[model samples]
Target: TVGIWILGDQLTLQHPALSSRAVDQSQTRILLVESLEHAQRRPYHRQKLVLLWSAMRHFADELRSQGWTVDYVEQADSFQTAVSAWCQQYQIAELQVMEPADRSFRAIISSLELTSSLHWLSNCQFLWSTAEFTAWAKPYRQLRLENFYREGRKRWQVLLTEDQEPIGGQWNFDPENRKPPKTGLQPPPAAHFLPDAITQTVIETVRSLELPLYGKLEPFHWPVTRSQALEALDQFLTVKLKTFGPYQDAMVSGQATMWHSLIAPALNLGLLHPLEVIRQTEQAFHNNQAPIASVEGFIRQILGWREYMYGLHHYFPDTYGQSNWFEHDRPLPEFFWTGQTDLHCLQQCFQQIEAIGYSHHIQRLMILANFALIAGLDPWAVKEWFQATHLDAYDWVMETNVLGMGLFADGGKLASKPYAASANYINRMSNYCQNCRYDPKQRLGDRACPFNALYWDFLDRHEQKLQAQGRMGLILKQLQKLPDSDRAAIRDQAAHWQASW
Candidate 1:
């Protein structure tokens, strides 16, 4: 008999091992493992733990109900040991699995010394395969997401006119989408599913483990099954997609899920396919349920950035993780885990993450990632923190997102510029500074926002290296105009804060 092993992230009925007609299910034995060793690698968010385990259990139950022979290994030592035991129990001669999305997982699965012969299947989760993306990327000196996104829109024929032009006579609506938070901006509430018996059991399973965990376990409203995931998609399309464009970047304190679709975890975990989500969003526009700006912006996230990140993750070498061009070596602050900072913006973001294991992209990029870049926090540490805490994080996603795009650790491989920003940007985008102890206007002294000094300090420190990049010239010109005395004081203040952390 042949054994079919399913990874936690690959929980879907569309999985090739389960869906392929060439292989007969009657002759196959399916296996799922709950590996404590992998879960203990980081102090993961408690809600993330519940979501993964509950989704895996629910998927296994679904497979079993369909008359498949499923063997779930709970509390397994590791994937290697669990698969070895399962193979021996049923005398499996060959093990078939879809090629993993991450390089790390592929190496682990390939390195396993087993009696069964391993057969790898092509992964179909993303819109492009690794070979297809490599072919598309080879001709360009600097791989830009904008070019790839346009090609994707053409290739898939999404949001296109009869002549294959973009529907709105433009490729990007980002300029129109950057409205700051206004007064009385109340977004529609997100859909929440109460924990059933399966989820409650998984919660207890997570609680019994004595490992260090990071977030709350109860009020876990994320969709764990396919039907529930579809419900989440419908809710976002009907209730939130209309207002999602303008306020997508705004960050109001105490509001976690603003018009943004919280579908990332489900989409990344294989409960939903990327192209299907894009088409459904496109349908919303044709039906007059959403504006072209909102629909296009939402589709670009999945069809453009999400797929681009995944493609770059595989296209770049594995050593891409270690590409710390700035050589930022400062440790991540202790307050990152505890949320005990005087900075009100950071405090608000962490409070939301602790309660729900989520925040919108703006809270991540502008507030969290922006601070790390300007403050010169270690990129590797920042990337690790992101992977450890978020529900949707994986090596393939976080490497390009955090290291390349977020922290510029990959030195503009993924983003054109370091997403470094001054406190002015935050003050413009969010209401956090209104209640913060520090002033966003001032650049010196205890009354000033740390971001102001750190932003100038980072620019000054990296002026020589940054001059080579085309986009940094204008910003670098601003740095050149600062008085020498003020420059020294800014560096001193930035150093003082780094030292304190």
Candidate 2:
């Protein structure tokens, strides 16, 4: 008899292994394992643990309903032990599995000690295949996401006209998407699903674990099944997509969801395919339910940025994770785990993560990562923290985003310029500074915003490296105008803030 091993992330009905060849459902065996040892690898968020296990259990039940023989292993010591035991019990000689999205995980799967021969199948979770992305990325001297995005648009025919041009007559609508927070701007809350019996059991199981886990377990509202995921996608298309474009970059103090489709966890987990979401978004534009800018922006995220990250995560070598061009080695402060800080922006973002294991992209990029970058926090430590905290975070998602784009750890290979910025930008974009104790306008005083000094000091300290990148010349020229005395004060203030943290 043949056995198929389905990973937790490979929960979709469109899995390639199921339809790849002629197979008898009753004669074939399917395996799904919940490895406690794997969950113990990091202090992962409690909700993240619940979401993965519960989704796996639910998917297993669905497969069983479809008349496929499934051997579900709960709380296994490891994947290898579970698979070996199943193969021995069933007298199976061959095991087929799909390739994992993460390269490191792929290595682990390859090295698994099993009596049965392993057959690797192509991963169906992503729209673009690994070979296709490599072919598109090889010739470029510098890989820019915009160029890659345009190619993908043309290749996939997303958001494009019949004449082979962008529907809006332009490639990007990002300029129109940069609206700041206005007074009394209200966005409808995200769709919430109450935990069912299966999810509740999974939540209790996670709570009973002896491992050191991060974040809360209760108010666990993530969709754990394909039906719920589809409903959530519909909610975003009907209610939220119209305003998602303008407020895509805006950050409000009390508002956490902000018209954002919180479907990343589901999308990443294979409950929904990228193409499914993109096609629905494009339909919304044609149906006149949303504007071109909003539809284009939403489609761009999945078809452009999400796929770009996946492609880069594979195209770049494994050594890309260690590309710390700035050599920033300062240890991440204790407050990162505790959320014990006077900075309101950091505090708000942390609070949201602890409560729900989520925050919008701008909070991750501008507030959480911007502080780490300017404070010179170790890139590896920061990347691990990002991986540990979010529900949607994985090695492929976190490495390219946190290291390459957020922290600038990979130099200019991923991003042409660093995302470093001062408090003025924050103050303009968000209401964080309004509630902050430190004054945003004052950069050299005791009550000055930490970001102001840290921004100036970061630019001054990395002037030489920044000069090498052509984009930073104008920003570096402004740094030369600062008097020696002012520069000393900025550096002193920046040092004090880092030390205090």
Candidate 3:
């Protein structure tokens, strides 16, 4: 008998691993494991746990309806043990599985050492294969996102003319996006889904767990089915994508989801495909529903950033875990977990993430990672916290994302310079500073924003090294203008806050 092993992330209906069967496919049993060992390995965000389990359960039911047997194991002492037991119980002579994107899981599955004849299938969930991306990347001295993005545009012909030219005669439109945080901004609320039976079952399972859940488990309202995911994409294309370009970088304290498409969690879990998402956004531009800037901005994130992150993860798997170029070793601030702090920016960003398991990309990179970089917090700890908290995070997505792009921890391979910033960047980009006790304009005094001094101190501390970075030359040149007393004051103040906070 043949057995099929399905990972939670690969939920496509046309999954070739399922479609390629030569024999009576109804007789094939699928192995689905819910491992307590894996969940408890890190402090998982409860919403993340519920999302995967619910989506898995729904996908299993979908498979069963298509005349397939599913051995969905919710009680596994360990992942490998469950698979081993299922194989022996069913007398499975061969096990077929789609290749997992997670490098860690692939290594573990290889070590399982099962006697069942194993067959590997090509993973079709993502738009690009490892070979496709690496082949395009190998020729470059530095794998630049713009260079890679242009090639992707050509390969897919996305937002392009039939003659293979950019449709708008522009390769990218990022500068038109991120307009100064608008005061009259009124983005439509994101589409929300209630708990269906599948989601409820998963919610109850998490509730029964004795291990500490990292976030609010109740009020979990994410699309669990393929239909609902499409509904979400519809909402974004029609309503949200219009405002997406202008306020893409703007962060408001009380708002959880903005004009940005909230389809990433669904996309990461296999409910939505990246190709379709990009096509729809581009179509909206042609439909006159969304501007070219908005459409191009949205497409760039999918093609340029998301795919590049996945490629970089595979390209530097071994070194991905240990690339802390800044060598900063401060422990993670308790505020990241508790969301208690004098800095309202940190508090809102942290608390919002704790409650909802998400914040947009700018919040993730500019505010969260920016603070971590300036404060000299441990990059590994920052990376782990991001992994543990984000609903959309997977080891593959986050390994390069938080570690490389966000932290700039992998030297300059993924990012040209550290995403280090001061209170000015935060103040300019977000409304978070308006009500806070700290003043973004000041550099000293108790009410002065800590980010101001910290940003300057970070530059002054590594002035010589940063001066060599071509991207940092203009920014570093400012330190030379400050008087010695001002520089000393900024460093002393930065040290005082770094310890006290």
Model 2, residue 414: displacement in angstroms?
1.0
Report, for all candidates in order, the number of backbone clashes: 0, 0, 0
**lDDT (Cα, tens digit) per residue for candidate 1, span 1-501:** 988999998997888888873358799999999898889889999888899888898999999998899999987889889988888889999899898888788988998878889999988889999999999999887998888998899889999989888888898887888899878878789889999999999899888888898978877898999899899999899888998899988989878898988999998888889988999999888988888888999999988999998998899998998889998988889888988898999999888888888878998999999999998889889988988889998999998899988888888978899888999899999999999999999988888999999999999999988998778888999999999998999999998888876
Over the stretch 295-327, how does candidate 2's per-residue lDDT look in tens digits?
Answer: 888888888899999999999998888979999
- In order, candidate lDDTs are 0.89, 0.90, 0.85
Ranking by lDDT: 2, 1, 3
Predicted candidate 3 versus true structure: per-residue lDDT over 149-253, tens digit per residue? 898888888988878888778998888887767776666897889999879988998988877668899888888889999998998888888778888888887
lDDT, residue 340, model 2: 90
Q: Which stretches of candidate 1 lie over 4 Å from their true place?
A: 21-23
RMSD per model, one decimal: 1.1, 1.0, 1.4
TM-score of each model, paired residue for residue: 0.98, 0.98, 0.97
List candidate 3 segments past 4 Å from native.
none
User: How well does candidate 3 score on lDDT at residue 114?
Assistant: 74
